Design a protein around this ligand. Structure first.
Ligand SMILES: Nc1ncnc2c1ncn2[C@@H]1O[C@H](COP(=O)(O)OP(=O)(O)O)[C@@H](O)[C@H]1O
Ligand SMILES: Nc1ncnc2c1ncn2[C@@H]1O[C@H](COP(=O)(O)OP(=O)(O)O)[C@@H](O)[C@H]1O
Ligand SMILES: [Zn+2]
Ligand SMILES: [Zn+2]
Lengths: 420, 636
DNA sequence: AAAAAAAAA
């Protein structure tokens, strides 16, 4: 009734049956053949159960087995476990662009403009030495066409072990990963995932000019499974409560004692104002910016962390924050990277230790609040970027205490206009 | 020998037939008066009368022709059916305009696609299919010629073999038609017989909008060809329309020349004749055919239209243009009439003249605005940035090393030795809007008064010397020392700027705030009304488009001076020099020849505003009044 | 990888 093509399959339920545990063990030994015959069986089972036959002949069927065995780490991988199913947990380090993979060749007899399709296997292609048309039958008239073939999307993922496997301050190890089709782009940088797949080994070409091969084989894992690590009616019931303001203000900071007014202000600025861009006058700022000052005995960083994690979008930084052209590390190319302030579009940008802000970056803030659009002109790139972000900062007075007699300006050491 | 007839791809012939059919007889109607347009026939007429080579086809106009039996058939297998479309286009053109062929590379660009894809959604199943993508261009390359159709000479018999189609490698022929010869030797390329085409490679990446979290942006390589070169400048967000292709590694392929990444595991393919024992890899690249971006008075009169004639004639023939004109500048702000008039005069500008021996005369107006905090001084800056073309907004303290004028940057042990352009350099032929003038530093503080008067910037550092053009019209704002303007003192006493900088400016405006109960209520009411009630319903006498039309019409006039104008001007200059020098010695020095030149420039600008080729001494009197009230203010 | 010269903070 859905039209999709996807099956989930747990091993423990597969293990609960006495005949199936034999199939369990045989799946452990021979993954590829078992998976292929299982997919063929499901392809037959669809038709066996529907007894529209038109949507079936277009789609394929695949399984996604999981929980076959306990998760193993890169620190214990014997060569005895080659071509067997294992489960891994780890953190994604880096991804790669989609790699086209040859599946069907397309040749053409240039003399007679005749084309034929040739299948391949194991990557190696058996080139035909003569055109099939015996009317011409020339041997050297066959030429490959690159852009009229069929391809598959291969992608390589780099994975690192979880830090819990290193008890004595050793360094983590990295294992390469491979994915196909629906598994492409399913993980990004910093993602914590668990995968299920078979093990593999491959020879190294060494010198590309000759046919010499190294005595050591590189190891990589091919996977078939990944996992990560009407409510509006309830809103209006709460929205009709008279004292919702006080409860909502006090809910943000459960451990903070008193300080009710600042909590109300922070909640209200989290709510945010309106934004309008009428043509004849120009846009008006809708962001709210708040500054906190006091001696370092107020737990004012706890409120910063509270607002950072509560808000949908927001970056928590300290005293670089904007876009700058960078030289890519692993690949020798030039990439434009956006800063922390740009990343907080529509959210709350949290700044800690605002006094030690240097001098070059402060003017940047003087540019980002009054116009909410930062421009850059470096390396031949001239452009303007939108920020539209809210600022919430904390500052400390100069000295062990803030003397009430002295006015605020001297103690914080900030420019009068920026405070204004 | 056998001469076997080639296979006829009838599908290509059928799609070509349908293509030429809806090319010849589209026959769409645009408006009521446009009964039959024949838009593509008119396009061919345009190529006749202007010698053009590219044609533009709308996808929507193609969409309703034969439904998906033709539109989808072309879009999906675009590479498959491209030569058939080329043949059909050549057939119809040589049916309707043989002399246009004088044999030439016709190009077709499809536009207005239903949807656009993100870079992260690019997948291999769409190879050879028409597509549209968007991103930020970050780098381009030089416009290099590209071999398209090569002609070859068989050296031992000097026979001619031509029309050899090329591929991703430089290909020589494989046979010689001469019966006595058998092409044992290779060929010599005939450069003067081959035909080349333009080629430029650009790089694009995902916008900051699409990219999630802190991951790195995805990059792609786009190749342009034909008339679409230099159309995507770095830093611009653009939309590309073209066909997905794939490029192999030519290094493994046979060539006359000599031959993250270390982990390998690439999809290598081996087993061919020419590869030997080498493996072939591939990479995704995009081919583009259409690029668009989403981010003399007689010449002006040539752009003729009913509104162009009527509106401009009405504006010229009116009697109270000036009275209305100043009322139409920055309708959002409240009050400050003279600041509006001054900004209008700055935006008109003055005539630029050069002497007979090569001495340049400054032809621009510089204006400074001084006032106590919060009296709506940055609003004028923002409005003039948003209205005046080629304008740049800049803060007084610049975070970059370029600062205001320029700077020299070199790579560590790198042979760059290149300059970077400051805001003044970018603002060429435009208006530079610096804010918070007070806290400039010494280098900029001494470079500005050379950039202003002489309109050039000169530098000589670390083996590179240059003289950059900085023809700009500056407008600046500042705040008095101590926060509030002290009426007791003068401009020099309150401001911290140096005396030479003050002489550079041509006009000054001082605006103050007060605690009067009658003014602040009106100010608050006007702010509230624009905020909620009439956020779009302001009442300016003239619209922005009319303002721009009149400004561009008035900019095409160069006023002159008459005898009475010269006599009145010299009398006024003598009076202004005399009366100020009567005050005190060694304490008042503010009038130089620059003031006379400023009078001339302001009179020329006022004459331009009224669209008069001559100058009346009333304009001189008005300019003198402005410059004198610039000194009335410093007294009060 | 390590020494030495130049512009900007
Ligand atoms: N009212 C309070 N309630 C709970 N904890 C507090 C309170 N005041 C101070 N603290 C404790 O004292 C510390 C104050 O540190 P803080 O001033 O936030 O450092 P910073 O210099 O980063 O602002 C907090 O870590 C908090 O645990
Ligand atoms: N129509 C108006 N009349 C008077 N003041 C205005 C008007 N519109 C905006 N303003 C105020 O003028 C200020 C413009 O900033 P600016 O004049 O540079 O003062 P500051 O130097 O303190 O930023 C804005 O903060 C705004 O509140
Ligand atoms: Zn053949
Ligand atoms: Zn020959």
């Amino acid at each position: 009734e859905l039209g999709t093509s996807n099956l989930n399959l747990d091993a423990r339920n597969l293990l609960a049956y006495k005949q199936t545990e034999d199939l369990y063990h045989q799946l452990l030994n021979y993954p590829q053949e078992v998976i292929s015959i299982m997919d063929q069986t499901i392809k037959d089972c669809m038709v066996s159960l529907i007894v529209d036959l038109d949507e079936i002949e277009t789609k394929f069927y695949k399984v996604r087995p999981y929980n076959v065995g306990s998760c193993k780490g890169m620190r214990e991988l014997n060569p005895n476990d080659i071509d067997k199913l294992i489960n891994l947990k780890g953190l994604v380090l880096r991804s790669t662009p989609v790699i086209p993979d040859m599946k069907v060749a397309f040749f053409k007899c240039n003399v007679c403009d005749h084309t034929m399709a040739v299948e391949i296997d194991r990557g190696v292609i058996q080139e035909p030495a003569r055109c099939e048309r015996i009317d011409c039958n020339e041997p050297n008239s066959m030429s490959l066409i690159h852009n009229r073939c069929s391809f598959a999307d291969k992608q390589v993922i780099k994975l690192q072990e979880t830090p819990d496997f290193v008890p004595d301050g050793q360094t983590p190890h990295s294992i390469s990963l491979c994915v196909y089709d629906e598994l492409v782009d399913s993980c990004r940088a910093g993602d914590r995932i668990e995968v299920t797949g078979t093990f593999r080994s491959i020879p190294i070409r060494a010198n590309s000019r000759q046919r010499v091969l190294k005595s050591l084989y590189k190891t990589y894992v091919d996977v078939v499974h990944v996992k990560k690590v009407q409510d509006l009616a309830k809103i209006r019931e709460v929205a009709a409560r008279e004292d919702l303001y006080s409860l909502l203000a006090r809910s943000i900071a459960p451990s903070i004692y008193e300080l009710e007014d600042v909590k109300k202000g922070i909640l209200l600025q989290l709510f945010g104002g309106t934004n309008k861009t009428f043509t004849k006058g120009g846009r008006y700022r809708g962001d709210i910016n708040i500054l906190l000052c006091g001696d370092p005995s107020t737990s004012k960083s706890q409120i910063l962390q509270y607002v950072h994690k509560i808000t949908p979008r927001g970056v928590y930084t300290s005293g670089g924050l904007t876009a700058y052209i960078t030289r890519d590390v692993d690949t020798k190319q030039l990439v434009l990277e956006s800063g922390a302030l740009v990343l907080s579009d529509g959210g709350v940008c949290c700044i800690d230790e605002f006094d030690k802000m240097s001098d070059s970056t402060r003017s940047v803030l003087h540019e980002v609040m009054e116009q909410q659009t930062i421009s850059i002109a470096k390396a031949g790139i001239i452009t303007t970027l939108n920020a539209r972000s809210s600022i919430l900062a904390s500052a400390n007075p100069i000295g062990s205490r803030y003397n009430p007699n002295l006015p605020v300006t001297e103690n914080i050491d900030l420019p009068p206009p920026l405070l204004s | 020998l056998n001469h076997v007839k080639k296979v006829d791809d009838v599908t290509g012939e059928k799609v070509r037939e349908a293509f030429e059919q809806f090319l010849e007889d589209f026959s769409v109607q645009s408006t009521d008066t446009g009964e039959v347009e024949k838009v593509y026939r008119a396009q061919i007429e345009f190529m006749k009368i202007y010698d053009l080579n590219t044609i533009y086809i709308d996808y929507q106009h193609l969409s309703m022709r034969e439904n998906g039996a033709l539109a989808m058939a072309i879009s999906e297998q675009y590479y498959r059916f491209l030569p058939f479309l080329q043949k059909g286009l050549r057939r119809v053109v040589r049916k309707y305009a043989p002399e246009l062929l004088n044999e030439r590379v016709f190009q077709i660009s499809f536009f207005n696609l239903p949807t656009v894809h993100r870079i992260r959604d690019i997948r291999s199943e769409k190879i050879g299919s028409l597509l549209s993508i968007s991103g930020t261009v970050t780098r381009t390359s030089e416009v290099r010629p590209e071999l398209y159709k090569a002609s070859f000479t068989c050296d031992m018999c000097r026979a001619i073999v031509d029309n050899v189609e090329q591929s991703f490698k430089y290909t020589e022929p494989t046979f010689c038609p001469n019966p006595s010869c058998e092409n044992r030797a290779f060929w010599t390329l005939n450069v003067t017989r081959s035909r080349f085409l333009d080629w430029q490679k650009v790089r694009i990446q995902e916008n900051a909008n699409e990219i999630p979290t802190g991951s790195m942006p995805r990059t792609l390589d786009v190749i342009l060809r034909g008339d679409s070169v230099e159309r995507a400048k770095p830093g611009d967000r653009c939309k590309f329309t073209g066909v997905e292709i794939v490029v192999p590694d030519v290094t493994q392929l046979g060539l006359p020349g000599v031959k993250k990444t270390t982990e390998g595991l690439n999809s290598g393919v081996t087993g061919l004749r020419s590869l030997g024992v080498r493996d072939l890899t591939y990479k995704i690249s995009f081919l583009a055919c259409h690029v668009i971006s989403i981010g003399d008075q007689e010449v002006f009169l040539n752009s003729l239209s009913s509104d162009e004639i009527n509106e401009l004639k009405e504006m010229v023939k009116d009697e109270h243009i000036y009275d209305k004109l100043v009322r139409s500048i920055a309708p959002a702000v409240f009050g400050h009439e003279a600041v509006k008039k001054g900004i209008l005069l700055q935006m008109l500008g003055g005539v630029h003249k050069s002497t007979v021996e090569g001495i340049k005369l400054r032809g621009d107006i510089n204006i400074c605005v001084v006032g106590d905090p919060s009296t709506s001084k940055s609003q004028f800056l923002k409005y003039v940035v948003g209205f005046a073309p080629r304008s740049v907004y800049t803060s007084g303290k610049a975070s970059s090393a370029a600062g205001l004028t320029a700077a020299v940057v070199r790579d560590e042990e790198g042979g760059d030795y290149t300059i970077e352009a400051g805001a003044l350099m970018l603002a060429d032929n435009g208006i530079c809007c610096i804010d918070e003038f007070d806290k400039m530093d010494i280098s900029d503080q001494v470079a500005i008064h050379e950039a202003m008067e002489q309109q050039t910037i000169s530098i000589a550092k670390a083996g590179i010397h240059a003289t950059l053009n900085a023809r700009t019209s500056i407008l600046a704002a500042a705040n008095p020392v101590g926060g509030r303007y002290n009426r007791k003192l003068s401009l020099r006493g309150n401001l911290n700027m140096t005396a030479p900088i003050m002489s550079r400016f041509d006009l000054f405006f001082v605006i103050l705030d007060d605690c009067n109960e009658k003014i602040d209520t009106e100010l608050a009411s006007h702010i509230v009304d624009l905020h909620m009630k009439r956020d779009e319903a302001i009442e300016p006498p003239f619209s922005a488009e009319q303002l721009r039309r009149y400004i561009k019409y008035a900019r095409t006039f160069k006023p002159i001076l008459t005898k009475e104008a010269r006599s009145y001007l010299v009398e006024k200059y003598k009076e202004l020099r005399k009366d100020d020098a009567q005050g005190f010695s060694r304490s008042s020095y503010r009038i130089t020849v620059r003031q006379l030149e400023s009078m001339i420039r302001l009179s020329e600008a006022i004459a331009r505003a009224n669209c008069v080729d001559e100058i009346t001494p009333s304009f001189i009197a008005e300019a003198y009044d402005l410059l004198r009230q610039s000194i009335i203010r410093v007294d009060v």
